[PDB]
Design a protein around this nucleic acid. Sequence first.
RNA 1: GUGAACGGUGGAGCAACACCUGAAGGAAGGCUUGAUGAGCGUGUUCCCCGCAUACGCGGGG
Length: 73
Amino acid sequence: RQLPNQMWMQTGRLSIVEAARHRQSGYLQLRAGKPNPAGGPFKTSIYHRPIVQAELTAFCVGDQQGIEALLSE
RNA sequence: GUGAACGGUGGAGCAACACCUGAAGGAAGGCUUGAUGAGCGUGUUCCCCGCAUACGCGGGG
């Protein structure tokens, strides 16, 4: 580890405002009048994934030329 | 088939209201724009200094 381990918050939110505009215009065919951030298509969800900046060392048995081309891609 | 692949930290919110930098404090006290310079004497070959190189030029008291 080159860095202290930190945490990435990320969220998934479907835009309720844009969906309301599209539902009024009819581009979105949604009969339901109310969103739900707890669950469903409009679930605003929060999720935290751990983050490390480090040096990655792997030991194996393989041809040097073949691995180098794959990891160069 | 990288325990992957997929995933918006978002929406709203006045820093602002009131509040006298200045009350008092001497530019003063002495001082000719008139002085200085602008007119009155010597009566003929004698000491020093350079250029020369003595045929003489220059200067000096």
